[PDB]
Amino acid sequence: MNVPKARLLKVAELSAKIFDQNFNPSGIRTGSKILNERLKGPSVASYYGNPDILKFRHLKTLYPDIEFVDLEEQYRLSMVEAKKRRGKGAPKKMKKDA
Amino acid sequence: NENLDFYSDFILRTGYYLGIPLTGPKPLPTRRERWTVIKSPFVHAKSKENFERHTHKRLIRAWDTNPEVLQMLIAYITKHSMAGVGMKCNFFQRSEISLDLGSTSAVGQKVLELLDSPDFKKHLEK
Amino acid sequence: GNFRFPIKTKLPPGFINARILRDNFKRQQFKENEILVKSLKFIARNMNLPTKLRLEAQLKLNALPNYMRSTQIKNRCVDSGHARFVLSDFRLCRYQFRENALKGNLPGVKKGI
Amino acid sequence: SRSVWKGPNIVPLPIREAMTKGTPIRTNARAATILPQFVGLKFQIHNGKEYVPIEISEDMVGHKLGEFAPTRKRFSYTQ
Amino acid sequence: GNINNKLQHLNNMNNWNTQIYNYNKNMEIMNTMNDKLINKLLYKMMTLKLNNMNINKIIMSKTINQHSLNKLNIKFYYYNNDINNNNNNNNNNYYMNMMNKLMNIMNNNMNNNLCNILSYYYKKKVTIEPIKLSYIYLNSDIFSKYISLNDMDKYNNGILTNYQRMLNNIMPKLNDHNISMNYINNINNINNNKYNNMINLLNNNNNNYNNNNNNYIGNINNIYNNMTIDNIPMDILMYKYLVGWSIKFKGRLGRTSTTNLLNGTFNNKKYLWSNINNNYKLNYIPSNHNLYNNSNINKNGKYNIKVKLNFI
RNA sequence: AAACUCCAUAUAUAUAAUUUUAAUUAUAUAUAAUUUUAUAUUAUUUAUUAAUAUAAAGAAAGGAAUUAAGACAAAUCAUAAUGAUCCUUAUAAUAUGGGUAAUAGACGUGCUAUAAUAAAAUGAUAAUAAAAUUAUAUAAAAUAUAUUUAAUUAUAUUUAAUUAAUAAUAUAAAACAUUUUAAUUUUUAAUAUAUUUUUUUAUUAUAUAUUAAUAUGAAUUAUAAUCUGAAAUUCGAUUAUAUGAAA
RNA sequence: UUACAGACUUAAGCAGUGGAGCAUGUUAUUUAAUUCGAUAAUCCACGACUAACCUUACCAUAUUUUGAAUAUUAUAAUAAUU
Numbered sequence A: 001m002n003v004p005k006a007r008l009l010k011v012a013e014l015s016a017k018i019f020d021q022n023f024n025p026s027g028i029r030t031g032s033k034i035l036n037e038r039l040k041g042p043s044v045a046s047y048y049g050n051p052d053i054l055k056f057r058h059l060k061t062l063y064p065d066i067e068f069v070d071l072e073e074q075y076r077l078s079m080v081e082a083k084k085r086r087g088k089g090a091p092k093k094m095k096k097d098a
Numbered sequence B: 001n002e003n004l005d006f007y008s009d010f011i012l013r014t015g016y017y018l019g020i021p022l023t024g025p026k027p028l029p030t031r032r033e034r035w036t037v038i039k040s041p042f043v044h045a046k047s048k049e050n051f052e053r054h055t056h057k058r059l060i061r062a063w064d065t066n067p068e069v070l071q072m073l074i075a076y077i078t079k080h081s082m083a084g085v086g087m088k089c090n091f092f093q094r095s096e097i098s099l100d101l102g103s104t105s106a107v108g109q110k111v112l113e114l115l116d117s118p119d120f121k122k123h124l125e126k
Numbered sequence C: 001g002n003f004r005f006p007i008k009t010k011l012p013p014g015f016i017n018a019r020i021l022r023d024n025f026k027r028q029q030f031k032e033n034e035i036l037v038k039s040l041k042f043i044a045r046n047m048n049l050p051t052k053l054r055l056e057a058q059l060k061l062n063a064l065p066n067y068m069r070s071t072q073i074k075n076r077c078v079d080s081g082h083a084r085f086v087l088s089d090f091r092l093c094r095y096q097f098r099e100n101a102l103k104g105n106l107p108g109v110k111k112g113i
Numbered sequence D: 001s002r003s004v005w006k007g008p009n010i011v012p013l014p015i016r017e018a019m020t021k022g023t024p025i026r027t028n029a030r031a032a033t034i035l036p037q038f039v040g041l042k043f044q045i046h047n048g049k050e051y052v053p054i055e056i057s058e059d060m061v062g063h064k065l066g067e068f069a070p071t072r073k074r075f076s077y078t079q
Numbered sequence E: 001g002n003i004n005n006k007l008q009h010l011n012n013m014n015n016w017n018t019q020i021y022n023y024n025k026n027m028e029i030m031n032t033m034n035d036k037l038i039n040k041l042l043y044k045m046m047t048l049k050l051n052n053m054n055i056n057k058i059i060m061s062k063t064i065n066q067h068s069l070n071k072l073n074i075k076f077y078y079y080n081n082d083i084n085n086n087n088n089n090n091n092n093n094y095y096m097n098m099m100n101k102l103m104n105i106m107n108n109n110m111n112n113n114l115c116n117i118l119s120y121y122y123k124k125k126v127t128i129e130p131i132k133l134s135y136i137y138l139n140s141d142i143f144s145k146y147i148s149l150n151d152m153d154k155y156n157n158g159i160l161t162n163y164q165r166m167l168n169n170i171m172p173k174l175n176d177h178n179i180s181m182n183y184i185n186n187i188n189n190i191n192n193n194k195y196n197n198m199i200n201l202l203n204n205n206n207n208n209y210n211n212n213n214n215n216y217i218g219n220i221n222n223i224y225n226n227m228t229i230d231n232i233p234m235d236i237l238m239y240k241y242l243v244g245w246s247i248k249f250k251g252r253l254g255r256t257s258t259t260n261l262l263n264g265t266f267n268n269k270k271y272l273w274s275n276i277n278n279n280y281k282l283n284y285i286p287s288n289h290n291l292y293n294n295s296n297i298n299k300n301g302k303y304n305i306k307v308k309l310n311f312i
Numbered sequence F: 001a002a003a004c005u006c007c008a009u010a011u012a013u014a015u016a017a018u019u020u021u022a023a024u025u026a027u028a029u030a031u032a033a034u035u036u037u038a039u040a041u042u043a044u045u046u047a048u049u050a051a052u053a054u055a056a057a058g059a060a061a062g063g064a065a066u067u068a069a070g071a072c073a074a075a076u077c078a079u080a081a082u083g084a085u086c087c088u089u090a091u092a093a094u095a096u097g098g099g100u101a102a103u104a105g106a107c108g109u110g111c112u113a114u115a116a117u118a119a120a121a122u123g124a125u126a127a128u129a130a131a132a133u134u135a136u137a138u139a140a141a142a143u144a145u146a147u148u149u150a151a152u153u154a155u156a157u158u159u160a161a162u163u164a165a166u167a168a169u170a171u172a173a174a175a176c177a178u179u180u181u182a183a184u185u186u187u188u189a190a191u192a193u194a195u196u197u198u199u200u201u202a203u204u205a206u207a208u209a210u211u212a213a214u215a216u217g218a219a220u221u222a223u224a225a226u227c228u229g230a231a232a233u234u235c236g237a238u239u240a241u242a243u244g245a246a247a
Numbered sequence G: 001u002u003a004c005a006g007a008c009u010u011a012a013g014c015a016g017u018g019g020a021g022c023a024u025g026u027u028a029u030u031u032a033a034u035u036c037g038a039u040a041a042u043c044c045a046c047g048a049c050u051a052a053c054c055u056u057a058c059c060a061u062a063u064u065u066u067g068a069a070u071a072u073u074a075u076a077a078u079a080a081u082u
């Protein structure tokens, strides 16, 4: 506390130089914090998982010899045909050209 | 703890034959994580279920060993690791004060590029 | 042929709904423009620069699309898509967490004492 | 309350055309800060449903356009 | 004793389908999500077809993902009823049935094995070990999936009187009490065989000062005399006998109806008459009990099959 | 079913080269009680008994989970999933802004307060915790400003250590001691006085109003500044000066 | 219809609720919209462990039309096979 401020400022400046630190004696807002914050993009963008997962549609070309059946897809197609037979099918979609 | 303790015992046996003085496994404080849920899917926030997860920890220390032998230990125990066990290794290398040949951020680069673009140079003109 | 978002994006590998698609798109575009937004924010908040350059950066920041905004990312349940009471330790809503926990799907989760 | 050291909330607006032609400026940027240049110009400010016509005076500088385009109707009870 | 031996208790690590610990929590979450997605994908690879009228459905249990420091092992149990060539001939020795073709792409195929594709998804070496179960009532998960997906024509118009009868004669009604007491007698015999071995090896003397510090009793052979792999292992193994099983149905098979079939014992007396102590899996399920639920869709809608097995 | 269990507790062994230190600890395994014994008294189905007390031994006193059946055709189609039915240039999809924050009355649940067995200051060789958190971070010390010697509080500048039994969030708080405290002339002040002296006594002055709101209370509101964010207008948080309602 | 037993049910004690301000939920009303439930016990800081944008399910305006899926059949650009 009795150490003159000039002496303590000389130590701070030299110390900052040796340790590659930003010496801002005035205190002006410099934005240095923004330049030092970490990039969180990679972690944020992986929230929902790796998109390059093997999918059922890729199995018919990876393993041509084997014939796989998608029961969920097969069930859906049967429900579509059933509704067509009851007359409850879907209306034909309007074409933009019209 | 079961796989953790079994694997720790195996490390001590590997080290002995490698000539590595080993201490442990020292048990470190178990971490407990807790989550409280409401059992019902929609309402009834008065009945809450408790869930927890315990992280068991063990410390094995190696002494008075050369770096090459220490790497052999880590390689072998890695090759024969057990399910559900994780491993962190802190290596300590004593060195001389002065060595021979020794032992720019993306944001800063873009700032320089932006400050040279016309949308910014058109103002910096003095 | 007509993707709903301005830029082509890959689909998440698991459960999908419109809200998940919208949130995922914002996550991908935030990552592509994170550096750009940080560089403009630096110029706009650095008091050593002239006010004109600072105001130019602020104007450019206000003109960025909403899908580049970090504050618009919302954590959703990766199994159901629900965006309320989502535990970040598992990225699941409370109900899906309980169901997965009791099935033994969460690596070290057991019922409390 | 935006920190004064950050400056005004400047938004892209067509002020040059409104100063050389006198046309009203239709905008949804209710957050925009009324800059001292805007004084005298005519703005049509969205309120969520309609665009409220408002001319800017010198006592409006510093405020934000949204402050002059109320978004709700006054409350009334069926007494 | 029970929890200090690998043959007398289930390791708690097996209570979880993903067996992993990563210091990087984000990578742990990612690995967990990858295990669920691959599990779903594998469920879609079990249904195979040779011709329009030859669809072979392989019933697969949930996967056990063993994450070690160097590799990931994906272990699952599967049941397949070979209905295409169930003969007494050796014609199956000259062709690969569809189930063998499916199992050989997991690891054997040199160009497009599923392990190499997954090794890039996980960024670590991956192995897949399919284990064949010959009965559908040895795994609660396989049993529920079979009923739900294959026995629908038996319980869609009520539970057939023959269907229920078959689900009640699966196992002979073993006497749990004598099996429990036989197990405890074997343990006592083994424990008394080792104590006698040491007592004799000490009374026969196999530095008096050193005779107060060391505890080395003598040659390993004498301490373990008459305790070999041919008589100790198979007698101490637990959960070896199915002693109870309950199969429930529910849903619409115009109102939902529930039918419950209960047959056998749902407890273990090995824990009562002995110091052996029971353990709860995930802290709420008794170790002996294995419960699984499988749902499917019919004309009316969703119906659930809840099966519970008690192995002691 | 209960128990057998698991937790807590007590104890033993093992582990830690006791500077990752808390060994007064950590966590693996094992043991222990659902306590036991003696005596007197009162009842009994009077005996090899209960209720009681007395004596002795003991650390021993608490918890969780533990499943079967049925009902309310109780909640949920808005955690996700299924049938039927309906929409398909729209009841699907995207963007900008607005709304979900409106305000007569009413209801539920909270917070703060209405003063003296209770509020406010101050307490640095730093009174005394536990359980958690920190790679989609926790942020020390220091300096600068508000702002005054300094401290305190807030923010800025800077970003030490630690991705952790190590460093940080974080010197716990109440407690306790001293001082102060409107209503209260129960005070304060001027003289004199004392063997109550941080105090006593005497004589003067110290207000009036007043069932009442103060040095209680902190709602409301003015102005300025700050924090997060691309953005704080509808509609966020903090600080300073001023405002000071009901109770 | 009888008789039993149980609890059911009060009391005592501590601090509260019911009164003021504010916070919050609900109702009612309003509104272009004030999203939708739950809404006696068993709703009412409940769904919701955080509504400025996002979240969002509502409103106004503008805009997209096989759209996020699977398959069929064409067309191409590309790499292998032959």
Ligand SMILES: [K+]
Binding pocket: F018, F021, F023
């Ligand atoms: K110590």
Ligand SMILES: [K+]
Binding pocket: none
């Ligand atoms: K809003």
Ligand SMILES: [K+]
Binding pocket: F115, F118, F119
């Ligand atoms: K008080």
Ligand SMILES: [K+]
Binding pocket: F172
């Ligand atoms: K403390």
Ligand SMILES: [K+]
Binding pocket: F213
């Ligand atoms: K007052």
Ligand SMILES: [K+]
Binding pocket: D001, F232, F235
């Ligand atoms: K505001």
Ligand SMILES: [K+]
Binding pocket: F232, G052
């Ligand atoms: K806003």
Ligand SMILES: [Mg+2]
Binding pocket: C071, C073, C074
């Ligand atoms: Mg958010």
Ligand SMILES: [Mg+2]
Binding pocket: none
């Ligand atoms: Mg309802």
Ligand SMILES: [Mg+2]
Binding pocket: F100
């Ligand atoms: Mg609301």
Ligand SMILES: [Mg+2]
Binding pocket: F126
């Ligand atoms: Mg202290």
Ligand SMILES: [Mg+2]
Binding pocket: none
């Ligand atoms: Mg500090």
Ligand SMILES: [Mg+2]
Binding pocket: F126, F171
């Ligand atoms: Mg202190």
Ligand SMILES: [Mg+2]
Binding pocket: none
């Ligand atoms: Mg105090």
Ligand SMILES: [Mg+2]
Binding pocket: none
């Ligand atoms: Mg006050």
Ligand SMILES: [Mg+2]
Binding pocket: none
């Ligand atoms: Mg009053």
